[PDB]
């Protein structure tokens, strides 16, 4: 899939809210896939850690319902899913293992250049 980031920032169910906030401050990501090794087990967002004690573990806060896409799908399918579900990031998994991630932020900038493009083709 195009517009896929292979350097995914993930967390484990045993990491604490405190360490996740440090990942947010470091990587500027507002959400992370939860993994056991590379196997996707959940998703966590900035909204989930609102008012949560910093010692709380991720596994008790994360959502186990995780929407994902396959590397065989296109960036336009991921854009459609993120627009339909209202989410800002979409993990890309293959055989249950996270192989990448697609952000709504990247595809929103990809739509702009597409409009900037296609005026040279006339």
């Amino acid at each position, epitope marked *: 899939m195009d517009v896929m980031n*292979t*350097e*995914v*920032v*993930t*967390v*484990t169910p*045993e*990491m604490t809210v405190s*360490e996740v906030i*440090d*990942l947010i401050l*470091k*990587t500027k990501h507002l959400g*992370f896939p939860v*993994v*056991e*090794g*590379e*196997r996707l087990v959940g998703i966590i967002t900035l909204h989930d850690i609102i008012g949560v004690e910093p010692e709380e573990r991720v596994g008790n806060i994360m959502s186990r319902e995780v929407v994902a896409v396959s590397p065989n799908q296109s960036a336009f399918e991921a854009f459609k899913i993120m627009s339909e579900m209202g989410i800002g990031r979409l993990p890309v998994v293959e055989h249950g293992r*996270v192989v990448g991630i697609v952000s709504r932020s990247d595809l929103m900038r990809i739509k702009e250049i597409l409009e900037a493009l296609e005026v040279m083709g006339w």
Partner: nanobody
Amino acid sequence: QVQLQESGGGLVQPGGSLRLSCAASGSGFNNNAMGWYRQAPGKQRELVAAITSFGSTNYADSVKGRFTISRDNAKNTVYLQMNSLKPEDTAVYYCTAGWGATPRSYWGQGTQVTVSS
């Protein structure tokens, strides 16, 4: 900014032990998460273990328990201790660095580990 240099590795008997080492250099390294990936002869790259600056570990299920990872924060060095090694553990082991439970931003040249009778 960031460079990784593997160390150790070689031929080991089935059920034996082996310790891999990796030192991170460069002014760009700043308590990054460090980990180990491996690639079997005919398979894709695959996570072995990883550890963050906070000390949080993450293991692939196939190596869980048999392998242990630790890191010296002052020396920017990560260690992978392997025990009860199996022939299926034979692969090129790459040292990685980045952020989170699966750091993939920077890579080393890799080191060979062969487990066979």
